[PDB]
Write a protein that binds this ligand. Structure first.
Ligand SMILES: Cc1cc2nc3c(=O)[nH]c(=O)nc-3n(C[C@H](O)[C@H](O)[C@H](O)COP(=O)(O)O)c2cc1C
Ligand code: SF4
Lengths: 429, 71
């Protein structure tokens, strides 16, 4: 078909821009907490089944099919109280879609905590707010106190027979702590250092108890996915990728904004319609980082007709992460921008594993050389090889997230890197 | 390393490294002789016998004349 058009009655995250009251008496008017008693009474298997049928995929960088992820949790509880850590923490460069759910309609996030908790047989939800979101977690603790006073959460899930309580943890400025296997530890009290995957969080995660880490957007669309139609949700986007992603058009657009819109939308259509347009017209575009910062670039010659869905952007030698589209026009120093991205991945890398801990400082040094031109024309092949040495070997996908920006920069703008290097050479002598 | 040991300011690339080491000059060295050039330009078989025989023919006549003078 032809995607992109989402009508104001189809946007799931109403009160995104905080125009209306976020808390109760303002959330019940937006349908929040509408009839969750019935949903909880409809059971856990029905919730998982409707989430799988709705084809909701991971709103976070992983892109995993939710629901199927929620079916990983154990059915019969063997004494370990299954938890539900909500990955409120983002810290991905470009990504504010979580910041508009923690505040500005947080009750959708709390009701999603509850509905996913009954969905995955959980017993408590730890909304891991990003550390810097102080005002956001204050709004969320206000809404949590409300949903506790209104009998929604705690010792009876919205009057139902489900004991489910939402506790609000908050980290402290660490993009690495945001990872699924590192959220469990940074919340366990230890450092935010990921654990290896052979113990999966669904098998032994938080406190060793089973758990599933869900981004706020996936857990927060869960309520309206169930209350509305799972067929209605899956009616958006392409076949596999389906839903209404919450985008964040980040930089070098004349009107930067985060706006919810149907997935599989043409990136050019999103840019030209909602956020205005690439500063100086579309012909001024240089590159676009379509996902968060954990995704390769798009050099504007494959950015005209690329759709903002997981599958197509993966097929374009890139990825749709948090869909925090970062736009860069012909006026920016794209090598300097990717150098600052690699500096970010050097800073926010908990250093647990050698391939990332060291090679990311290495990538930052090579990028801060190539952005001046101090390198040699064969280093652009070392940089590719260094990134491919980091990629598959790191404990978590941060290694990926640090090798992918530089890999995409090389793959696409190798002419510009080589030009800077040759210009440095001719500047000498 | 090995691009920070052989600098050659500029060079834009890992090739074109200085690479100045010992070797023959452009065009090689001169053609060096190895054969045995032993010049046989001496007195021949004759001219040596005929110098000896000639010395005997005249010098012994001189010995004779000296014997005549001494006698
Ligand atoms: C490199 C990397 C970056 C991540 N970035 C985010 C992020 O920005 N936001 C988030 O909620 N989770 C993030 N995560 C955690 C997971 O990838 C995933 O987003 C989360 O555990 C579940 O989200 P989902 O249920 O929507 O797939 C990140 C993990 C890795 C390894
Ligand atoms: S070194 Fe990189 S991959 Fe390893 S735990 Fe730290 S951030 Fe994750």
């Amino acid at each position: 078909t032809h995607f992109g058009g989402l009508k104001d009655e189809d946007r799931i995250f109403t009160n995104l821009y905080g125009l209306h009251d976020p808390f109760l008496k303002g959330a019940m008017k937006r349908g929040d907490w509408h009839r969750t008693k019935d949903l909880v009474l409809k059971g856990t298997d029905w919730i998982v089944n409707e989430m799988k049928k709705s084809g909701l995929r991971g709103r976070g960088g992983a892109g995993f099919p939710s629901g199927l992820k929620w079916s990983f949790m154990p059915k019969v509880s063997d004494g370990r109280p299954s938890y539900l850590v909500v990955n409120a923490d983002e810290s991905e460069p470009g990504t504010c879609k979580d910041r508009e759910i923690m505040r500005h309609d947080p009750h959708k996030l709390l009701e999603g905590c509850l509905i996913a908790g009954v969905g995955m047989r959980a017993s408590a939800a730890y909304i891991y707010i990003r550390g810097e979101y102080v005002n956001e977690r204050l709004n969320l603790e206000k809404a949590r106190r409300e949903a506790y006073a209104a009998g929604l959460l705690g010792k009876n899930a919205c009057g139902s027979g489900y004991d489910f309580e939402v506790y609000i943890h908050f980290g402290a400025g660490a993009y690495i702590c945001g990872e699924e296997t590192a959220l469990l530890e940074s919340l366990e009290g230890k450092q935010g250092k990921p654990r290896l995957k052979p113990p999966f969080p669904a098998n032994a995660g938080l406190y060793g108890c089973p758990t599933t880490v869900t981004n706020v957007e996936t857990v927060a669309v869960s309520p309206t996915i169930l209350r509305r139609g799972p067929e209605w949700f899956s009616s958006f986007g392409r076949k596999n990728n389906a839903g209404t992603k919450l985008f964040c058009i980040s930089g070098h657009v004349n009107k930067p904004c985060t706006v919810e819109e149907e997935m599989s939308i043409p990136l050019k259509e999103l840019i030209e319609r909602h956020c205005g347009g690439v500063r100086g017209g579309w012909d001024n575009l240089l590159a676009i980082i379509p996902g968060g910062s954990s995704v390769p670039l798009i050099p504007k010659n494959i950015c005209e007709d690329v759709l903002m869905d997981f599958d197509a952007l993966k097929a374009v030698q890139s990825g749709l992460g948090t869909a925090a589209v970062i736009v860069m026009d012909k006026s920016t120093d794209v090598v300097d921008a990717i150098a600052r991205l690699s500096y970010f991945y050097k800073h926010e890398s908990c250093g647990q594993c050698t391939p990332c801990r060291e090679g990311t400082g290495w990538l930052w040094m090579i990028m801060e050389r190539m952005k001046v031109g101090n390198a040699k024309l064969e280093e652009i092949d070392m940089l590719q090889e260094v990134t491919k040495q980091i990629e598959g070997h790191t404990i978590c996908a941060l290694g990926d997230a640090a090798a992918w920006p530089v890999q995409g920069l090389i793959r696409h703008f190798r002419p510009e890197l080589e030009r800077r290097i040759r210009e440095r050479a001719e500047r000498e002598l | 390393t090995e691009a920070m040991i052989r600098n050659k300011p500029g060079m834009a690339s890992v090739k074109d490294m200085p690479l100045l080491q010992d070797g023959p000059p452009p065009g090689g060295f001169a053609p060096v002789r190895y054969a045995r050039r032993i010049s046989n330009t001496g007195p021949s078989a004759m001219a040596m016998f005929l110098a000896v025989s000639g010395a005997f023919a005249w010098g012994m006549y001189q010995v004779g004349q000296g014997n005549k003078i001494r006698r």
